[PDB]
A paper describes a structure:
APP and its paralogues APP-like protein 1 (APLP1) and APP-like protein 2 (APLP2) contain the highly conserved heparan sulfate (HS) binding domain E2, which effects various (patho)physiological functions. The ectodomains of all APP-family proteins share the N-terminal E1 domain and the central E2 domain. Comparable to the E2 structures of other APP-family proteins, a coiled-coil-like fold is formed by helix αB (Gly302–Gln338) and the first half of helix αC (Lys344–Arg379). The C-terminal parts of helices αC (Val380–Leu399), αD (Ala406–Val437), αE (Pro439–Asp468) and αF (Pro471–Gly491) constitute a four-helix bundle.
We identified a new orthorhombic crystal form of the E2 domain of APLP1. The respective structure was built and refined to 2.6 Å resolution. Indeed, the N-terminal helix αA was not observed in the new crystal form (although it was present in the protein construct used), suggesting that it is rather flexible and becomes sufficiently stabilized only by certain intermolecular interactions. The apo structure of APLP1 E2 revealed an unfolded and hence flexible N-terminal helix αA. The folding of helix αA is shown to be independent of the other structural parts of APLP1 E2. A similar arrangement has been described for APLP1 E2 in previous studies and was functionally connected to heparin binding. Despite the similar overall topologies of these dimeric APLP1 E2 assemblies, the Cα r.m.s.d. value of approximately 1.5 Å (for helices αB7–αF) is rather large between the crystal structure described here and that solved previously. Beyond the differently structured N-terminal segments (N-terminal residues Asp292–Ile304), a high overall similarity of the heparin-bound and unbound APLP1 E2 structures was observed.
Residue numbers in the entry:
A (entry chain B): 305 to 492
B (entry chain A): 302 to 489
The structure:
Amino acid sequence: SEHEGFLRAKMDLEERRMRQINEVMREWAMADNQSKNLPKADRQALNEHFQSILQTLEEQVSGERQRLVETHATRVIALINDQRRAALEGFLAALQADPPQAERVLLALRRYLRAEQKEQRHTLRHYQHVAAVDPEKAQQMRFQVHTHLQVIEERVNQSLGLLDQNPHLAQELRPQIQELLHSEHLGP
Amino acid sequence: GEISEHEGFLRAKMDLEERRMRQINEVMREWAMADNQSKNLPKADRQALNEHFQSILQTLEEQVSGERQRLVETHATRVIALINDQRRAALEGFLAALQADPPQAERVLLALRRYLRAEQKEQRHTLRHYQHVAAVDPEKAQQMRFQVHTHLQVIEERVNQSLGLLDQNPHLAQELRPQIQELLHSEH
């Protein structure tokens, strides 16, 4: 599970780094106790030695976290994309069967819409997370999120357009689909 | 309660996320729905329509971050106070066991164990907070760097002073010295 591995990956890093930080803080404390009677100019330079070590360490933690986050986001989006495409191909296949079967078509469409529901939720959840901790960044992606939602809606519309090519089948399934579109917030 | 504080903070964050998401979801929906309606409209009307929704979202994003910041700062303040109280409660118990007539070795050890545990927790939280700020905001971490160092030294002193209160009773200190070192080894 991508969620499992990512969670414990952040955990291992939090643990590794908390030890390293403690060890540096430890060594910093020792050097102060050792140089407690040194002149002020001597003591300034010593602190600056350990501040320098911690800045590098802070930067490494920061870059480490950015990489962990971006890799995870890339994979989640990759999985969502693949679920959608796989579901589209399956749906297309149910449509193209001889003859088309309402059950198979319905189940296949159900998978496709569910993949798009997932894509919508993720798009909105992430936008909402960014707004919570970075309003300036949220303002910047605001229109791209909006655009993303339009792309999804247009996918759902185009898929419903394919089912409509078989008018009887579209009629036979319509009530169940309207129920599905309301529940997943995907229709028009 | 420490655990209650944790769980209550998660339900408080979760509930804020849900409420806000629903709000955002509706506005984004309305924003997508408004676009289909406005495709025929003049460019001035089209842009005004977008500016309407982007405006509503801007205040939302600001509210969201405002809520998140307030919630986080409150939780931070409480956790700190909780740790201070736990330390002070443990210190009193430790002194009570030492100042009792006469001291009982097993009680002094338990009281001590509770105090070091409190300081372990204090130290641990001090470190964790610092690390988290480093991962998300290197500039703030550089700022708080010296204070964390100072804080850890203060904790190091307290552990020594308490160990020094025990050593003031030489037989007691000898009776417990093998057990005391085990405690210190596992923690600090």
